[PDB]
Amino acid sequence: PAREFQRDLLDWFARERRDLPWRKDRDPYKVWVSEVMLQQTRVETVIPYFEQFIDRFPTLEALADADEDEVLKAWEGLGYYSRVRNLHAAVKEVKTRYGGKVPDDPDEFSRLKGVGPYTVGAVLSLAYGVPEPAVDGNVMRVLSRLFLVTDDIAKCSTRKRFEQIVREIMAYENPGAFNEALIELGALVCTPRRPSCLLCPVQAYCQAFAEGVAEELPVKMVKQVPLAVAVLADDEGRVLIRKRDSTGLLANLWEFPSCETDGADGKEKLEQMVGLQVELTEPIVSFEHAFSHLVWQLTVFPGRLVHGGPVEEPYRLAPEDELKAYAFPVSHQRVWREYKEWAS
DNA sequence: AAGACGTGGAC
DNA sequence: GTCCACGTCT
Ligand code: SF4
Ligand code: NA
């Protein structure tokens, strides 16, 4: 009863659609940026970042031409920073390989880094009208309730199944609208907790509602790392920072020099990291920072740095008022915050 | 197949 | 505390 389903869904969407910043138009760049920003991030969090980011990088080409530090700094605080290194690389490739036009073919677009099955669907359906499914966590919830699908959401195959369902029931007349409506339904009505079934526009089609199980769907299924962090100031009040490797945790972000210590075993593995001259006094605060897959237990040790050689490697001597220029992870932003109200 | 990869806010 | 949060890449 897909034509039935479509009308009721599409009609609700026309009345209820939020005026989000990225819905001002269907510019593929604009759509693409927002969809990358919205991955594992709440709409409310994204709104300010999207605006500053577009203000700063108005077009695809502006973004491609920007320094990566510039781009990381625009992302600073959003999390999952490889989203933006991927977006940046991908956007560079569209400029050069595709004349600056986001490819409207699913296979070509999917090949860009950071661009996966969901992003292909979202961007190409919204921006160009391509009939590809755009199945996110939202959509998976909706479809898992509509169709009483009890496969584990984490399984790669479950997503494939959902996409089949979309290809079957999608309004091919208007795929962007259909895809966006499915998403908005998940965002506003068919919510993780307490879905608003009595108000849902597609309730008559929904099995979970008829079975009394809306809330139990979809079905679905961390290590500790101790860290010592050094804040080292000149007599000129210039602070020692460093850029992280381009691979792995918090890639390419700047940090106050640190190392994993495994147990509260000293400030010496800190004082060790030489290659220039430092004595370290007693630590001033200790807090912890959660990631998705680990927790940092941080201890920050204030210190005095003397120059006895050049500054190379990934380290860099930044004066105090220039720290605000670099992208720091939130954890290391707090390290600095504590260090400063300390020195009061 | 499943772990890496941030962050903040509702509950 | 938990869940959001499949999103993508590995
Ligand atoms: S009826 Fe309840 S469960 Fe079924 S789609 Fe609408 S909100 Fe989701
Ligand atoms: Na890809």
Side-chain angles (χ1 to χ4, degrees), chain A residues 107-117 120:
Chain A
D107 294 77
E108 205 68 8
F109 187 55
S110 77
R111 280 181 182 116
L112 305 182
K113 235 192 316 290
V115 172
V120 173

Side-chain angles (χ1 to χ4, degrees), chain A residues 257-304:
Chain A
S258 78
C259 63
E260 316 189 11
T261 66
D262 327 348
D265 71 340
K267 69 187 65 177
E268 64 163 14
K269 303 119 295 76
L270 216 43
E271 283 184 316
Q272 184 280 315
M273 297 195 80
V274 56
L276 199 60
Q277 284 132 8
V278 287
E279 212 161 14
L280 276 181
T281 22
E282 304 309 313
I284 52 169
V285 73
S286 250
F287 61 96
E288 98 186 6
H289 195 82
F291 303 69
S292 278
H293 62 306
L294 64 129
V295 183
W296 271 350
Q297 295 144 258
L298 286 90
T299 302
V300 354
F301 301 81
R304 197 83 58 93

Side-chain angles (χ1 to χ4, degrees), chain A residues 9 32-34 74 88 104 107 114 124 148-149 162 192 202 205 208 235 239 268 273 323 338:
Chain A
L9 179 71
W32 190 3
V33 174
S34 77
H88 194 208
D104 57 342
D107 294 77
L124 295 202
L148 220 57
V149 179
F162 283 131
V202 301
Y205 309 95
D235 317 34
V239 170
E268 64 163 14
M273 297 195 80
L323 285 173
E338 306 289 320

Side-chain angles (χ1 to χ4, degrees), chain A residues 184-261:
Chain A
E184 192 81 340
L185 185 74
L188 301 187
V189 178
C190 187
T191 49
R193 293 150 272 188
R194 285 181 45 98
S196 299
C197 305
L198 310 172
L199 296 187
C200 177
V202 301
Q203 178 214 104
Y205 309 95
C206 176
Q207 275 172 263
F209 175 75
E211 289 271 52
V213 304
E215 255 159 333
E216 319 293 339
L217 291 170
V219 312
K220 24 192 295 185
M221 343 209 67
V222 141
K223 86 173 101 57
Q224 296 271 307
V225 186
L227 194 72
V229 178
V231 183
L232 296 168
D234 270 347
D235 317 34
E236 286 78 38
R238 291 168 291 188
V239 170
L240 195 76
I241 64 179
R242 69 171 179 186
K243 191 188 204 154
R244 291 181 61 83
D245 298 16
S246 66
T247 66
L249 189 59
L250 296 166
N252 281 358
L253 264 67
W254 289 82
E255 69 181 353
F256 304 105
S258 78
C259 63
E260 316 189 11
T261 66

